[model samples]
Target: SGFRKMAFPSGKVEGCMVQVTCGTTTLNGLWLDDVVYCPRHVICTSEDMLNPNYEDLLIRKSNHNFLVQAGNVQLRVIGHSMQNCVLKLKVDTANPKTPKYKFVRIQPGQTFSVLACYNGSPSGVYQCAMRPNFTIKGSFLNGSCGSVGFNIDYDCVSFCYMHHMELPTGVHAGTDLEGNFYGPFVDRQTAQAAGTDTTITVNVLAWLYAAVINGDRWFLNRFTTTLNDFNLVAMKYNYEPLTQDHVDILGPLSAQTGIAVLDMCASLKELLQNGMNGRTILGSALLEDEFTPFDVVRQCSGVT
Candidate 1:
């Protein structure tokens, strides 16, 4: 997937944000767009003021100027508008024509606040307008503003997996006097139904670690040449007694070896691959190779 584009923050936004530490008039248009698209939510230095799009803000000014901060349950406002006249903050509850709303007033150079549920009524989108008592058509000498924003983020979640090469996360591994095992934390009854025994699971993990995890990469020049041999062999291990004995063959297991799998810290680099036609060679006879490490763990025996 292409990178998530940095967007004009508004409209239920959820993404990364970067901050711009400084800006100047000489900043080329291309550079500005680049900065806006930067991983950081762009912020211009305080002195080099730039106006944010009113439409890109959940709350913004239109007819008259106002500064406000939205809260989880309230909004704060400072009387930074041009004139000192009293003003009312109104909310459009729901029905546009209902005239239903919440209200608050503020004085010049001061601040006012309102709770989500206030004015002893309902609520609506934030709307502010001048009171009928006073008005201002005066010159807008100078004004500026500052803001803070959320650097929202996320990952594209999909089917995922990782080697037990490093410490595992999202799993519980432990070794008490009882035994050793690891799996999703679960009730013993649930694990019992599926033969989900951690003892065997954890013990097997160690052998794998020895053969692979910390298996030495120094293969003694273990292999050479363009092609390699292949072979498939099977051995036998018995656990089906649980089957013949009328016990749950796949039930949760109780093994006594507290094999500490985590203690294994090894590495290996096996030079291996299967050649075409399942070809395996040894000296002059076209037969089997010495061994296939993977086959050691699997046996041909199956339940009749």
Candidate 2:
């Protein structure tokens, strides 16, 4: 009645006994040589009406919990014949609240349906949605079967880009935008490409200021060299002397190194392009755990 090990010799049940457990009761069928015996619950779907010889035994069980908790039953069928045994579990009960699938075998060319949840409602009603990273190979079938099975990667997160230094990445607090929210410069291009109202601005002081304060040695080294060149022009003329606070924050450019501020001042877009093209700065690759103040947003309700 539990963990059946069947041998379907010549696609016939004549050489074996099949015992199945349904609910609280144990039901069985026998196919002895020259005689057929089926309990009141089983049918003799054979020509002799008394001999079910090779006719596959069909076991049926149905309940509301089947769908709610996925397939909790274990069924195994093994035989030399390429034919399949039968075990039909009707799932018409409660809706599954999580991503779930039963371990099953799939014959060479069969499709299986694994249940997953899509969050359309804010209240968390479980709906069908296609997620990623589900693999099936060897010894299973699902939702049907022939040879093998699969598992669902229930806790997968879709990666999204973030602003370099502004708000945290992805969806965060209630006030944060949910979808793709780009930075100011990228947004300007997006608006312009779509022919919308736009007011552009320019600023680069923060780059050198924040670089020194944040202790980014790479940025500081190039910035201080540039400042030293500016100081050379200042010393030759009559410009205000650069103080230690100014020197510490935006260190003085030592000797006349090749590094120099190309233009007096430039537009945000132009300067950004020049800086990026020069490859003096690097973009940050923010990960989920790297979020500051608050944790990164993720879909994880269907953990089971």
Candidate 3:
């Protein structure tokens, strides 16, 4: 209650203070969302944690400023100023001429993070290095560390995909099983038809096609070995729409076992719905896991 009040133009006005700058210093009242949503423009500190870094204090905060975003990223070459210069960035979802250069720096009431799985992609925009303009910020995966499905470009691409070949560079094709319409997800937006508990390197078949349009049968057999490794990436990128009985049961040293799991589950559902000849088989090295509803598979507790 920090001293009560009751005025309003609409609402949210009690103890609602702001104006907590640090460089030329201004520490006024403190809390209108800890000063407009607080992004390292920090105020007051004894290094008490919650990221009010002066690290080694060293005074003279030198040149303080801020800007940092997530998923499709932004914060390139000193915007409002952040001292010692050059911690560059400018990503757009997943590939923009990718990673030609990337960097990080955070000061002025610091706290850093850069582990986005995806929100919108197609920009790699590379530049991994060429320091000096505003250096000394530390964070990673603005490069998506250890990416399996989250990686990228300085300069180019197949930009992004999944509009066809049965869908995958980013998806939207024949999506609505059977009668076909390619329901949603790419620029289509389904988010599990409005349930949207939110979503992720969001790779793993986009939470395995939102757990098969709505999950069932033991959560699609607990990711059938990442959906049988994209059904062996549609015959390792060339199963050529298999058929000599799914090319005689899978592969070498491995043939016949209930005719190889019910004829490769109908040739992995015709290579997961007519792809490979069109493309997107291993459906992009798999997701970073973010098509939530806890990766779709309804009711372990919602009980019927």
Candidate 4:
């Protein structure tokens, strides 16, 4: 049977259905699936397993590469998102006996590309060390051990922070209460809208409002504890505005004691929109404190 010739135009050939005809008779008539229409053409090939060594040489090896390619190349750390967190990559070739791999911290939202090259030397295996925050894990590139093929590795950390009341011990709050503090108080509405769980919301609120009632010192000493208790609440149906009442309760004490209350509401909201969990939330919370507060002098007392 003779095959019919079909002509396709340029630009309009996308997803165009073509019929196959042979001397006015349809021969397995079906649509022509082409990546491009005309002027530009795309070609693809299927594995030929009929060859004598096709199974051992091509099929099996190709299958291994396929799996390794999907798993190793452009590697991303599990349970981590590319937001505020840092990712680091390092290669250690010093100790042939015991190779050491160290993670190099990279900027958030940054991409790290690693290419494997072997010049006929003993193939060395490359491993990935990922640190989203305090937690760390490692993954090895399969079949990358020999270095015959190129292995590209890419990773990112999740943007999140853990909630804690106390700042580092050595850290001191300046007169403005800005430097020493991590968060002022996260907005309740923002927290709910961010999909914060009842437990976390309660804890944040309790610490925030606690600072209002007693003082900054009380809030600081009991921030984590208050947060833990607040977190126990099953539901957070009650919504309170950050009104003057709240300000009056917490502001005076915070102001008098020069204690800073960092407001993580905005960042938390963002994290919630992305996804929320203990690790993610905590990681983001820590990142929120990386910024330094504006410097200001309140008063210079000169006693007679």
On TM-score, the leading prediction is 3
Best by lDDT: 3
Give a tens-digit lDDT track for model 1, residues 1-304: 1111122122221111111121221110000111111101112222322333312331333312221112222222322111111112221121112111121222111111111111111121111111111111111111100111111122221101100101122221111111111222121212222222111222222223223322322322323221111111111121111111211211112121222211211110122222123322211112121111121122111111
What lDDT does each candidate get? 0.18, 0.22, 0.24, 0.20
- Model 2, span 13-39: residue lDDT tens: 111122333333222322122111222
- lDDT per residue for candidate 3 within 171-276, as digits (tens), equals 1121111112222322122232311121111122223333233321122321232335544554543322323432332232123122233333444444345533
| Better candidate by lDDT, 1 or 2 | 2
RMSD of 3: 21.1
Candidate number with the higher TM-score (1 or 2): 2
- Predicted candidate 4 versus true structure: per-residue lDDT over 168-283, tens digit per residue: 22111100011111123221112211122112232233233332333222213322222222223212322222233333433443464454332323222333344333442222
CA RMSD per model (angstroms):
26.9, 25.1, 21.1, 25.1
TM-score of each: 0.13, 0.16, 0.20, 0.15
Best-to-worst order by lDDT is 3, 2, 4, 1
Residue 21 C-alpha lDDT in model 3: 37
